[PDB]
Every structure is written in structure tokens, then in C-alpha cells.
Ligand binder design. Structure first.
Ligand SMILES: CCCCC[C@H](CC(=O)NO)C(=O)N[C@H](C(=O)N1CCC[C@H]1CO)C(C)C
Ligand SMILES: CCCCC[C@H](CC(=O)NO)C(=O)N[C@H](C(=O)N1CCC[C@H]1CO)C(C)C
Ligand SMILES: [Zn+2]
Length: 185
């Protein structure tokens, strides 16, 4: 069994606004399988062949709530400008520290759960330290910046019932956030 867009729920579903439940670790086969299918989905969505074979909208991350599972699980598969790949399948991911300084994609953010465009900068912390447990069972401590840090914040926001547009400015989507700068290479 594998995930497709049919499994992705859209905004309006209360689950997207609830706080995902902590995953009991060591993880069960069920939760492991859920997470395995999540990272498979994200990676397949970036392969033209597979994306068409299952009509998948390309994306660089996914949170369990998005597929109807209210548990703390995320999948991230993003490559930065330097060609550095950040591929993670995680249980109970949490930001233990974030920079005061912020950043943002000038073209905004999109979400697989949102069938519409919401223009405006989505302020994000430039640097974050994340602690979680990999699908492989090992605890991990990741220090991210730039695009990878942005994707992690977006996915973890999903686990706390937060949507990307909740961060967009009030009646001035393009105002420069205090102490910040557009995403750098
Ligand atoms: C940048 C924050 C992380 C985005 C994660 C989403 C996937 C998602 O909804 N996760 O919960 C995605 O890939 N969204 C894409 C997106 O918003 N992107 C992809 C490149 C950067 C940004 C556009 O500015 C669109 C194209 C589906
Ligand atoms: C509407 C978008 C306008 C963004 C313009 C900046 C221009 C710049 O000053 N770069 O250093 C850019 O290309 N930035 C990149 C960017 O946003 N890109 C590069 C490829 C496309 C787009 C990401 O969606 C970085 C931040 C990743
Ligand atoms: Zn999303």
C-alpha cells in the first residue's frame, strides 16, 4: 500500500487544527509503516515517472495529520542550492531552539492541504535545532538553516495545528519582517 493525493486531506478537516499525539517509542509496526509510506510519497512526488503514475503533486515534505493520522510524524526530502540533500523520516520532531533572526521565501509558501494560493511572506526562523527519532529508531539532533529549516518549520507547524498562512502579515503580506532577510543562497 502506498499514498496518493486521494489520501491527502484539505483544509477544513478538523484534524489539521488539532495537536498531533506523541508517538510511542520504540515505534510500532503500524507507525513505522505510516512513516515509511510518508517519505516514499515525498520522494516519489519528485520523480516525474512516479508522480504521473500516481498523479502526485510534487512536494518537499509531509506531516502525518495531512494524511489523516494525528500523530507526531514528518517526512522531509529537500535539496538546497548547493545540491545538499536533507532526507528525513521522523517521529516526534521538535524544535528545541531557533534563531531570533528570521527569513522567508520571497515567492511565499504552498501546501498540499491547501487547494489555493495565499500570497505573502511566511516568516521563518533562519536557523533551528531539531531533535527527533529517525524511522531507523535512532534519536537525531539536526541543525538546519535556509530552505531545509523552512520546510521543517512548515511540517512541524502541521503537528501543532498551525497552517502556513497563519504567519502571513495582517493586511500587508509583503511587509519586511522585523530582523530578517529574504532567503539567501
Ligand atoms: C517551503 C515550505 C515547505 C513546503 C512543504 C509543501 C508540502 C506540504 O504541504 N507539507 O506540509 C510543499 O512542497 N510546497 C511547495 C512549495 O510551497 N514550495 C516548493 C518550493 C518552495 C515553495 C514555493 O515557494 C508547493 C510547490 C507544493
Ligand atoms: C518571487 C521570487 C523572487 C526571489 C528572487 C531572489 C533573487 C535574489 O536576490 N537572489 O539572491 C531569488 O532568486 N531567490 C531564491 C528563490 O526564491 N528561488 C530560486 C528558484 C526559484 C525560487 C524558489 O521558489 C532563493 C531564495 C531560493
Ligand atoms: Zn503543508
Amino acid at each position: 500500500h502506498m499514498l496518493t493525493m486521494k489520501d491527502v486531506i484539505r483544509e477544513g478537516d478538523p484534524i489539521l487544527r488539532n495537536v498531533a499525539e506523541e508517538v510511542s517509542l520504540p515505534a510500532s509496526e503500524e507507525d513505522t509503516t505510516t512513516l515509511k509510506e510518508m517519505i516514499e510519497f515525498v520522494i516519489n512526488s519528485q520523480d516525474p515517472e512516479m508522480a504521473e503514475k500516481y498523479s502526485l503533486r510534487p512536494g518537499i515534505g509531509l506531516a502525518a495529520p495531512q494524511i489523516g493520522v494525528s500523530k507526531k510524524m514528518i517526512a522531509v526530502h529537500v535539496t538546497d542550492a548547493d545540491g545538499t540533500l536533507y532526507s528525513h523520516a521522523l517521529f516526534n520532531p521538535k524544535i528545541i531552539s531557533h534563531s531570533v533572526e528570521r527569513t522567508y521565501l520571497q515567492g511565499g509558501e504552498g501546501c498540499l492541504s491547501v487547494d489555493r494560493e495565499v500570497p505573502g511572506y511566511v516568516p521563518r526562523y533562519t536557523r533551528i535545532t531539531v531533535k527527533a527519532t529517525s524511522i531507523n529508531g535512532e534519536e537525531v539532533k539536526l541543525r538546519l538553516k535556509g530552505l531545509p529549516a523552512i520546510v521543517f518549520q512548515h511540517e512541524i507547524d502541521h503537528l501543532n495545528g498551525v497552517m502556513f498562512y497563519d504567519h502571513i502579515n495582517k493586511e500587508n503580506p509583503f511587509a519586511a519582517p522585523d530582523d530578517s532577510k529574504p532567503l539567501e543562497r
